[PDB]
Amino acid sequence: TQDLNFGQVVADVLCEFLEVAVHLILYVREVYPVGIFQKRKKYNVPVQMSCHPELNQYIQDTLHCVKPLLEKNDVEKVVVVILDKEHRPVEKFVFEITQPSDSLLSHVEQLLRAFILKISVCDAVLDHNPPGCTFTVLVHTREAATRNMEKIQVIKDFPWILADEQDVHMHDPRLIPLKTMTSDILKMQLYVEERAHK
Amino acid sequence: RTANILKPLMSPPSREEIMATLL
């Protein structure tokens, strides 16, 4: 049939999906005013995307650095951490990833759609978050390897550092699974860790 | 050990900062 194949499709599909999910999470958790968001269609369902260049550039730079590590399946978890005014983690949206095309590639599209839908309504299964919140992103690699750090430093003005306990530690976290998908080429789950009392 | 955990050095614009509509 065809010989033209990207080979790095899965990583790009994941990166693209992660961007949409991050935008949606920021919307439903009200980390930013609904004003900067514009309704859109992704995976054939409605999503909310930011139109703010500063924010968009931050999210894009972040995932671009991640991409290379995804291409080699060195990433165990990608986490969106919602922080309150005191800069303490209050919520964590965890994407636990495991990487074991054509129509089958659209198959994952259908599978990823379930995660988007779950995020859209997670507002219900979670407790309201504090006022002045912001966020950060954490990348848990499968193994502590210098190669991972090498690969991630792909943008001069956007460096990465090793996280600190104060960046990840959350008080009495409660688990809230949202979606688990299983299949060849991609096994992943999304769950939220929520501080017991906000 | 948090030896396998990486994060961006830079912080994203705060919701407050965003309040300054520059589009």
């Binding site: 495991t98 409660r174 688990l175 809230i176 699974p177 688990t180 096994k187 789950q189 860790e193 929520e194 | -």
Partner: protein, 96 residues
């Protein structure tokens, strides 16, 4: 991979639970333990969505019973699930 008495597919696992919970009256400890084993296997196999749905489904059925035996069966099951989540994921399942 994880299964409850041979049942793998979620729907099969669930129907197995309803049948058991709504028709026995005096559940055997061996079967209660089998359920604990299944739940801990779900944790190990990284299928937290299935764990959440099953805990929620058993909770509905085991508590909506005047029969305290099921009330206690559920507490025991959740209890051993939480202890394992706390050490593996570092958190406990939110149940409400």
């Amino acid at each position: 991979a994880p299964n409850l008495a041979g049942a793998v597919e979620f729907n099969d696992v669930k129907t197995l639970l309803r049948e058991w919970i709504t028709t026995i009256s005096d559940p055997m400890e061996e079967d209660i333990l089998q359920v604990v084993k299944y739940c801990t296997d779900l944790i190990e196999e990284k299928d937290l969505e299935k764990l959440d749905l099953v805990i929620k489904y058993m909770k509905r059925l085991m508590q909506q019973s005047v029969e305290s035996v099921w009330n206690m069966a559920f507490d025991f099951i959740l209890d051993n699930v939480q202890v394992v989540l706390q050490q593996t994921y570092g958190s406990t399942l939110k149940v409400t």
